[model samples]
Target: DKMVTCIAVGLPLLLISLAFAQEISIGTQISCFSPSSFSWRQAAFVDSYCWAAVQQKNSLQSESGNLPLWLHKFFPYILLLFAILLYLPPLFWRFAAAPHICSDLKFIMEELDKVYNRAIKAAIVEQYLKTKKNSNNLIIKYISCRLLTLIIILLACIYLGYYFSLSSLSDEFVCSIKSGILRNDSTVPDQFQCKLIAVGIFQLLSVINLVVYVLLAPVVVYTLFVPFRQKTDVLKVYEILPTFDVLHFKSEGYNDLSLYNLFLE
Candidate 1:
């Protein structure tokens, strides 16, 4: 479920990518309206040849030859790709990578709860009674989980910007069907009439995608500011090293750290 957004985004992109993958090479990709006088097989054969498209390269044409019909054909799928891109930063994931960051941070939070359990915290206080020493010894410091999250957001923003910048699309070309035994059969039509299908609403998605991450940039920085701004506060959010206290004195010695007691402070 955590990967839902990425999966939804990627599969469609791959499908649309395959839909246009044939554009990479030089060949004919157009289909002409065959003569009605020709037998059905002739037209079908020409159609099949256009699909074959194995001739010297020629200029590919589009309504805006400079642009492509795929801009509209692949629009929906590409739009979806970016649409799902929005769900990501909030999920607290890695940029261009999924690492279950939300779950990872959650595990850390669970650890914090247990380490500072009333019983263990009390033991830390009791240990001070015995040692007469104030032990900052119990634990400390958050190495920017907040920014790590914000960093994910920032990186995602950059990728979305990059993707939006490209704005390139594949084009349709003319396909020639003449070959082999029928190599130069003047009777057969040179090309067949065929078209590729593909594209959707990317605007709102990009807008929301950029907006979410952009807003988060300042939000996280401001959240971090609260901790550093105060004079006496210590950011105690991330990791740990619990005190060597009473309960740990196990009789079983399964994984012990006790024998070096020659004034073992």
Candidate 2:
């Protein structure tokens, strides 16, 4: 059931996240200014200095043209991409690795219960069968669960670290306006120091991502220790077979007095 739930929810999110990342990587938000607005010499100057000094309040007016208009138009979308990337790692972890870890935990828990029950039965009979208490089998299961938890936790940490690194570096990027019709324009700036608009939002995202990853680390560590914490006793406190037989005869399995009795018991 855990496996079913995990796969059902995780797969779609993983695919969509990768698709979004791909879209971000391929596209950038900047567009070059048109050459028609100014002469060749003036346009060149505009493209170069306009972008380089975009944020300078005093440098707003240019002899060639207004390039900040283009920057303002695409500013929001460019920031959106950064924000999306900042939020993506958490989604990716939940989608890609979470299900596998949960499934493994469920399976290991089930097997542990099964073996513990079998061991209890063997111990009661005083049968020293090698198969019943094979230390290697239990050790292997324990190690496998531990390794899975460790690997997934480490992977998540690495992803969170990478996200933090990206958040710092992505704040400022160099955009070139020397392309297209304005290639030879002297008024255009060669490079503009563009700061992504969503740096504050991205900073928030980084903090949130780091916190979530930190919280998940202890959970993963708990998985490694869970086998040792499990109770080793297996005892049936009561039997319902006789009561069930009477109820089976009375209700034809549709309704059972034994269920009521079992509830009371």
Candidate 3:
């Protein structure tokens, strides 16, 4: 149960922490090397010229196209998108499945307490020499809950695994930057190399993601076996059982009236 609570709280915190860190580390800058004396507009023009020229490089077969440069610049943002997309399934599960899990937990706890009480009652009956009836039936309900949890956890693992796999690939991409409006210009090179600046930070994020996810898998596996390991019969039933009659008696003494009706009454 503590393990489940840890996962419930820890996973979202981990995701949010990574996202925040990514935002901080993801610097937006286009590195454009200008001639030592070029004006700001010329530098801007040069940058834009190189940025736009990339696409034309492949088709024109120009030696000056630097499209790869722009690609490298934007690669970190692209990887961030990829990481978030990978995170969506578990996020969706947290929203859609978490409430259901809470309800299932409540129901299972109630059922376990109820069954435990029944076993206690059976044990007290001395006249009827009863064979110890297997209390495995109660386990069936818990097994169903375990199966649902297992299915969701497995899907989460797959989603996280896919992202981890992609993280291994290169974040740097090549771009050509010399063929657009400035093709006629003699000063600009046919190509300028650009590398993504944020790949290092993104790789660190991926490592964190992988380690946490790998740890979660064993916990998930252990949770799946909890029903089989737990005693479905009586251990200490009286302490755990709900006393509904006492609860009702305490509640019955209280006046029931809404604020609106209290004034009219």
Candidate 4:
């Protein structure tokens, strides 16, 4: 359970990274059909011109033809963005909340380790009673982790939905290349139907990412309520209990075994 959150966030990011690498190392993202009569240079021009033009024409989409959502063209970079976003919840925990929680956790854990030896008396222990005895509300790790994780997961789902809906528009487009140099050449065809070669890969990655995020939703919600369960119950209170029991002893070293109430004066 301690590692669940990282796995939920990390797996999709890793898969998408591999998918992005596959395209980077061994794939052509776009290919176009050129007229047979046209020379090699002209055919190459159709692909290059369309690919570049498509990317730089966000403003032209309305006046000319609608373009695919900005995602498919930059799908790899989008995954990079996803990876960064996935780490954010952890990043905040570490920077904003971990230190306060972890500092005391180590203290409780180490002290309890000493207390674990068979003792004459079982002394009652408390939770954070000593640390928060005075001032400050810095011990907010659990709730903050819950809220940030929920927020990040929901946003990721929205992002995935946006990607899936727009990807269909990216499969292929009619690219008109008979404008500048080819306009006067009757031999050149009016337009070429160019297919985005990695459309299948992009769609596959999006589907997988969306599915994972959906599955992680319930898990995130479960984690949110843990704070309540964790607040009490003798076993749960042991999280901060010292390893060594500080036995209250009498003349014969007799000690009383009793329940330790937590977080109270």
Candidate 5:
């Protein structure tokens, strides 16, 4: 499970950063075609102004009703958010729940270290497990953490899928240049042909992320069902042992359920 968490949490971290590095080397993102007659300062102003308003709604652009909230500009930030979301589930399990499980696991390991010793002291372990109450909540907490992880992964998959499909849709826009002092200037054009250049890398990253998540989805699902499939009376081990009678002692509780599941590691 830790290995699963390691991949699930770390994959996004490894893939998204490359795009950020690419953004730095490729400095100019919004490139607008300014007219040949326009001064360098004027062209620079058009690029800067359009970049600032990339996410803003432009009522003047007659071609499309609204501009999409330029997701490419914020792609790395969104990826950073997804990585944080993925880490939270494991962090919750480790910080809030693992110590409780660790103590029980330590006890079971110490008591059942040797075969003959386990046969002798198995009843002691069983009694100790049976005495632990409020364990139902712990198992539920664990399942909820797993469920939360599953949900976050599913959502991330959907987002990546959607982004990949739509990445080729639009990168070009007609940027309005008439504003403030440029409003009355006939020398400056009303609109310039602008394209957001830092975009193809986002599609590539999305493809990588989506493929990884699709593979990880099955693993997360299998992990979620592990407790159900692994269920058994802890005394099943003792029943077949040389000393204990199967007919006399027969019961399982949340405590025993959690102990068996914890011992799975």
Candidate 6:
């Protein structure tokens, strides 16, 4: 579970950092092919205006083209948001449940020590375990967090898959130049070629992210169902204790036992 959490959380963060570096090296996300007759300022304006308006429809699609949403421009930001979301389940487990589990394990171990030293009866430990039947909220919370992570991963995959399809079309567009001061200038072309540069990198990164997450999905399912597996039950091993008989009748729920099993596995 820890390894799964680490990989699921770390992969996106690493990719996001790589994306930032890619942005730094490239210096800009877009470039436009202005006509040679256009001055330097005109070319700069072409690039800046097209980049800003990339989400808007081109002149050809003015009648019906919906906004593209231009998801590539915010790809890294969305990926970073995903990384933060992926980390949340583990963070909740750590802060909300781990300490309680830790203290329970400590007390169990101390009881075991007392049993070994003939200092206390094992019936007390059995009673202690029995009291935890209704106190299974930690496991419930743990499962909920795992389920949340699963749902988030599935959503991220869908998003990346959708983005992959959008990337190819998003990189190139016709930028309308007949606006503002240039609105009446018949000399300026009505539209020019504009290209979004970072979209290629975004495509590659999203593919990698999607592949890793697809592989991760099964591992998360395995972890979520770990406690319910019959083979993983830790109850049988408690037969080593002298008073194991007392645990047999009350072992039907096995709530606390499965909690330990989940932690161990």
- lDDT on C-alpha atoms for all candidate structures: 0.43, 0.43, 0.48, 0.57, 0.61, 0.62
- TM-score per prediction, in order, is 0.34, 0.37, 0.48, 0.68, 0.74, 0.73
For model 2, the stretches where C-alpha displacement exceeds 4 angstroms are 1-130, 135-142, 162-169, 177-188, 195-201, 230-265
Report RMSD for candidate 6.
8.1
Ranking by TM-score: 5, 6, 4, 3, 2, 1
Once model 6 is optimally superposed onto the true structure by TM-score, how far is the C-alpha of residue 56 displaced, in angstroms?
5.1
Question: Lowest-scoring 10 consecutive residues by lDDT in candidate 3?
Answer: 237-246
Which is superior by lDDT, 2 or 4?
Answer: 4
Candidate 6 global CA lDDT score: 0.62
By TM-score, is 2 or 3 better? 3
lDDT (10s digit) by residue, model 1, range 1-265: 2223343355335534543543553154344467676777777666665444432334453333544222333344454565455444434334421233334344344433454475346563344333323434222212233444555557757755654544444324445543543865756545434554321124324445566557546754655454455442444322221112212322223223332352385
TM-score of 6: 0.73
Q: Write the per-residue lDDT of candidate 5 for residues 227-257, one digit (tens) a residue.
A: 4344433223221221111112233334434
Tens-place lDDT per residue, model 2, 1-265, is: 2322243245334434543554565444233454355577765565455345555533433322342333332333543544445344445545764464456445334444555576457672233222234333322432344344445445645654655654544544454544533766755435545343444544454455356547655654554343334433212101122122222221232122344665687
List residue ranges in candidate 4 displaced over 4 A. Answer: 1-13, 16-21, 24-26, 58-68, 95-99, 113-130, 133-135, 167-169, 178-188, 230-265
Is candidate 1 or 4 superior in lDDT?
Answer: 4
Q: Per-residue alpha-carbon lDDT of model 3 for 1-265, expressed as tens digits? A: 4446566556656666667766675466445656565687966776666455554455533233332233334434544554455455455555765455556445444544554576557573332212123243333443345345556555655655555545544343344443442667765544444433555665455566557667777776776444334443233222112122122322321122232365587
Residue range 34-61, candidate 4, lDDT tens digits: 7775678877877888878776554443
Task: Score residue 232 of candidate 2 by CA lDDT.
Answer: 35
Candidate 1 is scored at a TM of 0.34
Clashes of 5: 0
